[PDB]
Scaffold this motif. Sequence first.
Motif, PDB file in Angstrom:
ATOM      1  N   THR A  23       0.800  -1.214   0.000  1.00  0.00           N
ATOM      2  CA  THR A  23       0.000   0.000   0.000  1.00  0.00           C
ATOM      3  C   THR A  23       0.837   1.270   0.000  1.00  0.00           C
ATOM      4  O   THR A  23       0.288   2.353  -0.237  1.00  0.00           O
ATOM      5  N   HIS A  24       2.139   1.171   0.257  1.00  0.00           N
ATOM      6  CA  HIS A  24       3.000   2.342   0.265  1.00  0.00           C
ATOM      7  C   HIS A  24       3.299   2.796  -1.164  1.00  0.00           C
ATOM      8  O   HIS A  24       3.026   2.096  -2.143  1.00  0.00           O
ATOM      9  N   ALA A  25       3.874   3.991  -1.275  1.00  0.00           N
ATOM     10  CA  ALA A  25       4.202   4.584  -2.564  1.00  0.00           C
ATOM     11  C   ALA A  25       5.568   4.158  -3.087  1.00  0.00           C
ATOM     12  O   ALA A  25       5.954   4.581  -4.182  1.00  0.00           O
ATOM     13  N   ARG A  26       6.308   3.339  -2.337  1.00  0.00           N
ATOM     14  CA  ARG A  26       7.627   2.905  -2.784  1.00  0.00           C
ATOM     15  C   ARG A  26       7.555   1.897  -3.923  1.00  0.00           C
ATOM     16  O   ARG A  26       8.556   1.699  -4.620  1.00  0.00           O
ATOM     17  N   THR A  59       8.287   7.722  -7.532  1.00  0.00           N
ATOM     18  CA  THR A  59       8.598   8.582  -6.396  1.00  0.00           C
ATOM     19  C   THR A  59      10.013   9.144  -6.470  1.00  0.00           C
ATOM     20  O   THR A  59      10.233  10.315  -6.142  1.00  0.00           O
ATOM     21  N   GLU A  87      -5.317   8.783  -7.317  1.00  0.00           N
ATOM     22  CA  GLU A  87      -4.967   9.516  -6.106  1.00  0.00           C
ATOM     23  C   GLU A  87      -3.543   9.200  -5.668  1.00  0.00           C
ATOM     24  O   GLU A  87      -2.764  10.105  -5.341  1.00  0.00           O
ATOM     25  N   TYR A 139      -3.905  21.330   0.339  1.00  0.00           N
ATOM     26  CA  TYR A 139      -4.125  19.938  -0.038  1.00  0.00           C
ATOM     27  C   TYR A 139      -4.568  19.091   1.148  1.00  0.00           C
ATOM     28  O   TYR A 139      -5.336  18.139   0.975  1.00  0.00           O
ATOM     29  N   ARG A 191      -3.955   9.759   2.602  1.00  0.00           N
ATOM     30  CA  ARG A 191      -3.034  10.703   1.972  1.00  0.00           C
ATOM     31  C   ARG A 191      -1.944  11.141   2.943  1.00  0.00           C
ATOM     32  O   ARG A 191      -0.765  11.224   2.571  1.00  0.00           O
ATOM     33  N   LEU A 222       0.500   8.278   3.333  1.00  0.00           N
ATOM     34  CA  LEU A 222       1.354   8.148   2.156  1.00  0.00           C
ATOM     35  C   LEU A 222       2.427   9.229   2.125  1.00  0.00           C
ATOM     36  O   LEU A 222       3.578   8.962   1.760  1.00  0.00           O
ATOM     37  N   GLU A 238       5.068   8.366   5.087  1.00  0.00           N
ATOM     38  CA  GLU A 238       5.929   7.195   4.959  1.00  0.00           C
ATOM     39  C   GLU A 238       7.119   7.437   4.040  1.00  0.00           C
ATOM     40  O   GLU A 238       8.112   6.706   4.128  1.00  0.00           O
ATOM     41  N   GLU A 239       7.049   8.437   3.165  1.00  0.00           N
ATOM     42  CA  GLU A 239       8.123   8.704   2.219  1.00  0.00           C
ATOM     43  C   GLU A 239       9.154   9.687   2.762  1.00  0.00           C
ATOM     44  O   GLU A 239      10.078  10.063   2.033  1.00  0.00           O
TER      45      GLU A 239
END
Lengths: 107, 131, 513, 145, 330, 48, 92
Positions: free
Chosen positions: B2-5, B34, B130, D5, D28, D31, D34-35
């Motif tokens: 589920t992460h963006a990595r 990313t 999204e 946002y 959101r 997300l 976590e980065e």
Amino acid sequence: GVEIETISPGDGRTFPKKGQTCVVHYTGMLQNGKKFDSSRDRNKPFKFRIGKQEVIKGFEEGAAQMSLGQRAKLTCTPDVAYGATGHPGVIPPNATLIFDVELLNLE
Amino acid sequence: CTHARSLWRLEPLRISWSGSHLRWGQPLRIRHVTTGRYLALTEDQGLVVVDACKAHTKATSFCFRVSKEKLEIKYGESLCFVQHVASGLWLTYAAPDPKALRLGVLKKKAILHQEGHMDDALFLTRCQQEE
Amino acid sequence: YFCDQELQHRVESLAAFAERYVDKLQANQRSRYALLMRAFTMSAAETARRTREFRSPPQEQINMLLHFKDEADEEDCPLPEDIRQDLQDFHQDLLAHCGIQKKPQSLQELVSHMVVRWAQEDYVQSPELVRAMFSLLHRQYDGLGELLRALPRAYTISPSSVEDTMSLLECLGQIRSLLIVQMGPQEENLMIQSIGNIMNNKVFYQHPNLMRALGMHETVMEVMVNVLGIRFPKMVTSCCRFLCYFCRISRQNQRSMFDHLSYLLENSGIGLGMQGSTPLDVAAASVIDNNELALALQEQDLEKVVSYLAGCGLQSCPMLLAKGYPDIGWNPCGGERYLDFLRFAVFVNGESVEENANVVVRLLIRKPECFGPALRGEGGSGLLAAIEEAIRISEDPARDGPNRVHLGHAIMSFYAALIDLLGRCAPEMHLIQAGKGEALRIRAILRSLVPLDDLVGIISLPLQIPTLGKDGALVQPKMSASFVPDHKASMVLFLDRVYGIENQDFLLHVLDV
Amino acid sequence: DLIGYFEPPSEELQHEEKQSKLRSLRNRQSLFQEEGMLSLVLNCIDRLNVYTTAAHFAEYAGEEAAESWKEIVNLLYELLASLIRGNRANCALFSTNLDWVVSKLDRLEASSGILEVLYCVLIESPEVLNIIQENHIKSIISLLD
Amino acid sequence: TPLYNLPTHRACNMFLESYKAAWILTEDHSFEDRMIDDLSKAGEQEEEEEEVEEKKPDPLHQLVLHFSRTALTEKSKLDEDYLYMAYADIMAKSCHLEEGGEEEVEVSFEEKEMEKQRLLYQQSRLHTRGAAEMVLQMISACKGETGAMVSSTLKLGISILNGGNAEVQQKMLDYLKDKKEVGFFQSIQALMQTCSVLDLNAFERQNKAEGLGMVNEDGTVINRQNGEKVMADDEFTQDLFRFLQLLCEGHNNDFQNYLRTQTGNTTTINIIICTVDYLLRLQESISDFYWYYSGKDVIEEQGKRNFSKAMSVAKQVFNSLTEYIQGPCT
Amino acid sequence: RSEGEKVRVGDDLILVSVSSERYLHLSTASGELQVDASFMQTLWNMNP
Amino acid sequence: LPGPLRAGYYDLLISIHLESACRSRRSMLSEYIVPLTPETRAITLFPPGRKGGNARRHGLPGVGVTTSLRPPHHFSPPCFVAALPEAPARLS
């Protein structure tokens, strides 16, 4: 020690002794005139006995020094008061207490 | 998961008309969304993600093959193998590592092997706009 | 508030009528028994009546007496017509009071009409208010159901036991008052004092049903869950002692505590098990001496405890080398508790449960690492070699010392516990003569696990007899360090259970050495 | 743009749509956290906190760059507050950063922002309450003083 | 043994338990229909004002809206709620009067039509206020965990769907397609996966425990027994398949296609394959029971009861499977 | 693979003796590969 | 007095003088344990009409006689002059 100064004269001969019951209407306050104690708000005289050290030593000495029916002001230096370990949230850890006491109904 | 990595962007090597559906064996580039890096193969530490300046068609080109045989894609459940263009190498797990086992890690390093394994087939899952 | 007052009035009236009715019931039963004993001319009918109406548990008797609700079944009740009519009148009065059958003459009608009118007048936007009115309205329509649900918490006591009871209540309140406060030293001390005061009260063990109704076990378990979810070990020890004593009070308490077996076994660990009473001891108390509870045991709990045994048998226990003891590679003392729990589960009332024994032995053979360095295919140390190594370890202080815990005695204790567990897992003799395949397979597996030669050799090992030595000072073997006869007792129990006695020659050979 | 946002849903919307928007905002925020965006914002704040005043920053970066120093600091604090608002995990990440937000309470620039950040952290994480010490309370009282 | 020798307080407690078990419990009082009728009446809101288009929600409408709001609230897991159970049971009993009927005698056609219309009106009293969406939200919020509230929700859904009501089916389908969520089918799959079958080891343990028969603080009889450990929650596993078969009642191809594949969503669950898998597991359990009991000459009472329970569950599963393909759904 | 599923060709299998409850382990400790029924498990392929 | 101040003072009085005892009694109100006393057996479900000839009439709630055991409340008078001294927790 405790400094006593009269305000209204009392009976003058009926002094309390050990083992008796004394009722007092008092009003305690800080040195800077910050009131924290008053028996008149509760509308009930405070009862105690001399000899069981239920109250601070300065209060006992002031009560025993003065006679029946006398209104007097007592100044309690910290070493006879709570001292460093004062009441949390009520009394600062170093302050002298001013009391306006009036003895009545000695038993 | 589920992460963006784990987001990869597909860019066909064709100059234009990239929106058309993919074809088997068509050269393309895979970019990390990313970080902006491009997957590539190099002689010094195998396959890594490099910058756009060092991204060339010789190393960044990969193709989707139906099977391991040498000699359109459904979005889900396609079992499309990945083969590096101009090479007989395929993406596969770096053989199980005892040290990794010692750390019970899931980081199964990816290695380009001339034969790989029988589990080299994989599915593609699109993420929401999204993300 | 007023609805709660109405419910309390109803339950109090029910209790008062219960006393009034039970007095007359006892008097009538006494009169009928006197008639039956004095007049026994119809000996067959008298015997039948005495067997059916009397010589029965009091609950069954009172159920039989109160089975006259329907006229069809009223023939089996020997109660007089007047007593039955009185009970019918009370039941009718209770139904009328509950509301079972314009100005709202009663409170229930007023509340119902108020709620309906409020709902009709405006669209309420407060969820709390809406929930309040709907719950109140449901109570108005379901008063009889409310009384039925409130009945289990109702209890009756004698006037001579009120005082202590009040004290108990006070203590309970304090414990409840400690739930909303985060755990701390003063709260811990007050909780310990309240638990002790609960211990010393006579009402606690005089009326176990009352304690079950009050749900004090659930409260103390909640407190233990809070403290565990280590800091404050004394509180955990006190909670475990309370639960063990509560289980020992009565059998129904044991059944009630058996429900939390999964959580108690899951939270049982080496660190939690090091100090004082432990949740593992609570589980053992909840499972000890109860045959149906032993049969109700699930295999997942046995799998979990076997996994704990294997885990403590793979690596050493951290606090052993934290103190400074030399590393050995496994945890014998940690596994001793699991072995004790397993043998408690397997062995009940002097007999072995075949289902639990088969499951336990299956899990044990499935994980050979539970057997430690000895009885290991890769290791192959042997029983005699392991015990002699432990003895020579305990002989010198270079390895035995880092004492509170001695590893040399720990090795022998763990091996003896394992041998005892395997011995009491043996099948019964009647099953053996019956020729059951499972029993023969289990016995063959047990014979394959250990041989007879190790048993006789280890039994032949002597002890440290206390000699006089110095005059006036007895040189005694200090316990928990040397080889005690407890190992010999447990493992000769093994020898009798599995191998038995082959013939006269074997018996004489065993007796010789 | 980032502050706009992460705006919370309006309280006048319907219950179901408000819950859906809350879920969208929560994922959101997760997300973005976590980065390493929160750590990047913290690094920027630490870099900009070296200079005490706008003039001191101008002594190293010029007046034109120091004109928007206070605005940038306020925007960074507002963005951090928006990132950590309503997220239990993000607030719990401040267990080791409690001193970081406490020590900057008396700073004149973005005092309201740091106070709001502290309020958001406290009302969501029981851990920071469990690790609250006397000196932090004394600093909070010194804020009133 | 004699009752007259017992202490007064113990005898009072025993009499209280006996009276509770024998008299209060057996007494039956009917109030669900009257309560629902009283709540359904709007009062005089429409009489006092009629200019408002939507007017105001009915008290029953407000109640179901409150329950729906609680169900839709974002929480880690669904928690126990006695009030919701009680009101769901009251509503289900209210709409189950016609279905439940509350020397064979022939029933006239007209009587059947009036009974069907009565059931339709009783179900319309509930599904026109949001019950159909409320039960779906409650099922989705259960996260596929067995409990009492999911049982109450399933019972209410069965009562609403009794007779194959097309209106409620259309409402649930429209809600599911509009929301496009995956929690409902995931919870259904989990609940179906947690269903129990015949257990032979539990049967042997129960038989041995009954053979023991030693009392535990209850006089002479142990007073410790349940339905049976061999097959627990059989009512729940029948209710689940009854609800599923009521969803596809009337040969509506829409549900028959939605159950197989959930188009428009990010994940699809095949309920039909799950039903087949559960039937296979039940068949294996029945085969094991037959193999165990083949050697015995006469089946005992416990075995007969277990066989009856298993065969009833299999009958319900077979009926659901017939419902999935009764219409010519290719 | 799970219990109740039909076995197929080229699938790893575990064999357990009914009488002895031991796997068909491949012993390699002595340097010569042998077969024995022991508590250690070894995968086998049943190729038609 | 202003509304917010009135509510604040009322809530302060309730919190500092009645909250703990009310919570304890609320916790204790769940159970119904009753002793066998002459007052217990004198409790009647229906109060008979004083005039006579009237029955099945409910009495006013909260006015009858209750016998269920509830521990009494405990309070300690406030005093800030007594000598300042495990120790039991302070009372309300």
